[PDB]
Symmetry: C2
Amino acid sequence: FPITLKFVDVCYRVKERTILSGVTGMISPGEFMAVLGPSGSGKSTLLNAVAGRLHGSNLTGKILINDGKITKQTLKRTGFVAQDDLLYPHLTVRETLVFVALLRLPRSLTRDVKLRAAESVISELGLTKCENTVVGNTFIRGISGGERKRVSIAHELLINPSLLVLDEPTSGLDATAALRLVQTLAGLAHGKGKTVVTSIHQPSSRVFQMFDTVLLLSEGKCLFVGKGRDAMAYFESVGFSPAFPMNPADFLLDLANGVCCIATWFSQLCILLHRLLKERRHESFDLLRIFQVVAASILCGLMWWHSDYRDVHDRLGLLFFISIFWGVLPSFNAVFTFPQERAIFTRERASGMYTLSSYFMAHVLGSLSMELVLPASFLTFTYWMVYLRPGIVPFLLTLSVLLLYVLASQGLGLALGAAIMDAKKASTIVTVTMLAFVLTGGYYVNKVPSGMVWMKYVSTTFYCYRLLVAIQYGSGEEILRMLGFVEEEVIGDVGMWTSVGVLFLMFFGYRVLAYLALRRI
Amino acid sequence: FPITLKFVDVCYRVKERTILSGVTGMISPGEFMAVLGPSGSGKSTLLNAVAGRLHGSNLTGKILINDGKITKQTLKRTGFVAQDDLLYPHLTVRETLVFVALLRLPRSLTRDVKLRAAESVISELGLTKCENTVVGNTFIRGISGGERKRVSIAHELLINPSLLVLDEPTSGLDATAALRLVQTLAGLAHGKGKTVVTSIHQPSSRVFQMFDTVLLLSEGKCLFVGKGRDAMAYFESVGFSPAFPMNPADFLLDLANGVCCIATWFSQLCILLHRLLKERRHESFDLLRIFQVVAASILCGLMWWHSDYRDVHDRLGLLFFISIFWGVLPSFNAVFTFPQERAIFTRERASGMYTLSSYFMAHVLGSLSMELVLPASFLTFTYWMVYLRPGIVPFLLTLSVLLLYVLASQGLGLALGAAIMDAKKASTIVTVTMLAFVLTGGYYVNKVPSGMVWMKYVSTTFYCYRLLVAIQYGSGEEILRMLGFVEEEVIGDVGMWTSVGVLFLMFFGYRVLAYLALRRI
C-alpha cells in the first residue's frame, strides 16, 4: 500500500523547553529513511510524533499520512517498534508469535490463516532456524539479542504495516548482527515496498551506505534532508569538510554537535490463559518454592507425628501453623505478578490485543489452578502421618477450607500489588497486613482489649483458623467427654457458615479491589 | 618510570580451543597502544595475559616487562582497570578515593600524603567539579557513567603505575563522553610519560586518530602491528582497500572478520569500618524496614495493651512473637550481605587492600552496631504499654536477652549466606532452618516425640524463649501463689545460664563458621 508520509513545520514545546522548531521531510514507499541525531537531541520525540504516540496541545503542525489527517484508520498501517523488547521469557518464538497473531489480527478470519501469517514473518525476518528454542531473558538460556529484536519487529509485522517506525533497533548488539538486521529492514523497503523509518544511534560504515534517505537534526532544526549518498555533497557545497578519514555518519553527528461480543471475550481469555501458562508454572512450581513446602511438610509431619487429638493445645498450634504458612506464602508470591508485567500489559493493551478485563481474568483464573497444587500436596502428606481426624469428609473439608484460604489470601497479594505497583514497596505492606492478620487470628492473644476486636473480623487468618478447628473438633461437645480451657479457644466465636461466607467475600472482594486498582494504569 | 613491554610468540591452549597462536608487539613509554579486535576474538585474553592476571601452564612465551621475568616486583607498576566498575553506592567520590588511598598505598607514609595522592588524581582525571556528589548506582541518584569509569581508573592510579592496562573503558557510554575519556588516557601517555594499553570495542573517527599504536588481531595471529596512522598504508601495500568511505577502525574490524603487624590490622579494620558505614545504615535503616518494625511495635503494643501478668498464656505468646519476629528479621537481612559484595571483595583482596580477616571482622563489628537500634526501639516502646515486669533490672535483662538473640540469629544469616553464596538459594534455607527453630522453640509443640528432642537444643529460638519467660515469670514459684499447666511451659527445661552460654556459643560459633565458609572464595 502506498504510504507517502510528509510533515510541514513540526513544533514541540514540552515542559518551557523547545524541542522541534522544525522538522520537514518526505518519506516514500521505497525510501528507507534513517533519522540520525546526537544523544537526547530530537530522535525519539520525532518518532513518537510521526507514529502518533504523542499528541495533544504540545504537537503543532500537520503530520499528514498520504495527505490525510491522523485518525486511527491511518494507524492500522502503523506498527511502531519500541526500543525495549517486552517478551514472555518462557514461550518459544513459534509460541511468542502465534499467540500475538491470534490476539491482534482481526477476529473475522480462520485459525490457520492466523497461523500462517505468523509462519510467513518467521521465515521472512530470519528466525526459521532458531524457531524451536525458548526466547528467554538474562537468566533463562534463550535466543540472541539480535534475534530478540527480530521477534519484536514481527510483533508489528502482523497488522501488515506499510509504515514501519523502528526506534533504535541497533542499540545493544553486535557489528555483524546489527549489519544483517538492517538489510532485512532495507529489504522490506526495497523488496516489499514498505516505508521504513528508523533511528540508528551510531551506525557503521556499511550501515550508512545501506540507508536510502538520511534526515538529520542537530537539536531540532533539521540540518540535512536528503539522500545519505548525497550527504557529503551538500556540506562541502556549504563549507564543511572532514579533515581526516571518517565514517560519513560520524562526520555528521559531531557537526550536529558543532564539532569540526461475548465470544470475542471468552477466546481472548482462552488465548491469554494458554499464553500465560508457562509463566504460571515457573512461578508456582519454582524449585525453591517446592523445597519451601517439601521442607514444611516434613517439619510439620515429624514434630506432630502420630499426634493424639486429646492434646488439644498441640492441635491448635498445628491448625495455626497451617493457617500461618498458607496465608503468608500465597499472599507473598502474589504481590509480584502485576508489577512484573506492567510494561507488557500497557503496550499490548494500547495495540488492541485485549482490554484489561480479559487480561485480569486470565491472571485470576490462571492462578486459581497452579496455586492449588502445593497446598493440596502438603495437606495430603501431613494428614495421615500427623493423625488428624480420620474420614474422607473431615479430610476433604480440611482441603476445601485450606484451598479456599490459599485463594482468599492470594487475593490480598493481587490487591496490594495492583494498588501499589512497586514490587518491594507492596511486599512490605503485604507482610505488615499479614502480621496484623496472624496476631488477631485468635491464637496468640485470647484476652484482646476492647478496641482491637474489629481487627479480627477483617482478618483472613481468623476465619481459616476458626474453620480448621471446627472441622477437627467441632462445637466442642465431645472432647469434654474425653477430657472429663476449650470454650475460650474451641467454641465461642463466629460460626461455620459465616466463616465460609466471608472467606468468599474476601475471595471475590479482593479481586474486585485488584481490578479497580488496575484501572488508572 | 620507563616500562618497555614487549612479548615474543604468546600462546594459549584453553579448554582444546586455540586462542593465541601468536602475539608479538612493542609498547613504549609514550605509545598509547589500542588493541582492536572483533567480538570474543582475543582482546581481553591478551590483556589479562599481559597484566599477569592469568598464568599457569596455559600461558607459553615470554611476557617480559623491561626485559624482565614477571614477578610481583614487576606488578606494583601494573594497574589493570577491569571492565565492571565495583564501587560502593553511597560514598562520595572524595570518600571513594580517599578510603582506597589509605588501604592500597604503602603504610609507611603519613595520613595527609595519602590524602593528597587521592586529591591529585581527582583533579587529574577530571572529577573535580563532581567531587561532592554521591557515586550511586542504577537506583541511587549519582554520578554519570563516564565519571564512574574515571573513579575506577583512579583506583589504579594510586599505586602510581607506569603500565596502565584498561579493559574496554568506552563500552557503555556516550560519544562526547567516551571522546573526553580517551584524551585523558592519551594525556597520560603524552603528558605524563605513562605506558597505556587499552582495548576499545568499536571506536569513532576521532578516537582512532587519537591512538598512537594499533595492535590488531583477527582471531589470534596479529594481523597489524604498528601505528594507526600507518594502518591504511600497510594494507593497500598488500592488497586490501576500502571501496567506500569508512572510519579507519571499521575498515579493519571486518577485515579481521574477513569481510571486504598488629597495628596494620587494627587500622585496616578501622578504615573498612568507616568506609562500610553508609552501607550499613542503608541496610539497617531502610525506610521499609523501619516501617516493618514501627508497624510491629503498634500491633504488638495494641493487641497486648495493658496486659495482666496473671494471664500466663497471653504472655507466653507475647514472648514467642518477640522470639519469632527478632529471629526471622535479623536472620533474613543478614543473608544478602556477603553475596552483594563478593565482586568487590575478590578484586580488592587481590590488589593487596586487605586479607579477608580485617574484611570479615569489619562486617561483624559493623553489623553489631546498626542491627541493635531497631530491636532496642521496639522493646522500649512495647514494654511500658504492654505492661511487662516493671523494674529496670527485668527491663535491661529483657533487652540484653533480645539484643543477644538478635545477634545470635544474625550470625545464622552470615553463616548461610557465606556457605551458599547465592542470595536467593540461601534465602530459602535460612527460612527453612528458621522454620525448624520456631516449631521446636517450645511453644507450638509441648509433647515433642522421642526423636525430635535433639532439634530443640540446636534451635536459637528455644534459648531466647526460655530466657524471656524466666525473666518475666522466673522458676515459677510465685505465679502459682497468684493463680492458686505452668510447669510444662514455664519451669522445667535448661537453665538460665545454660541458655546464655549457648546463645554466646551460637554467637561466636556462627561467625567462625561464616569465616570458614568464606575461605575457599
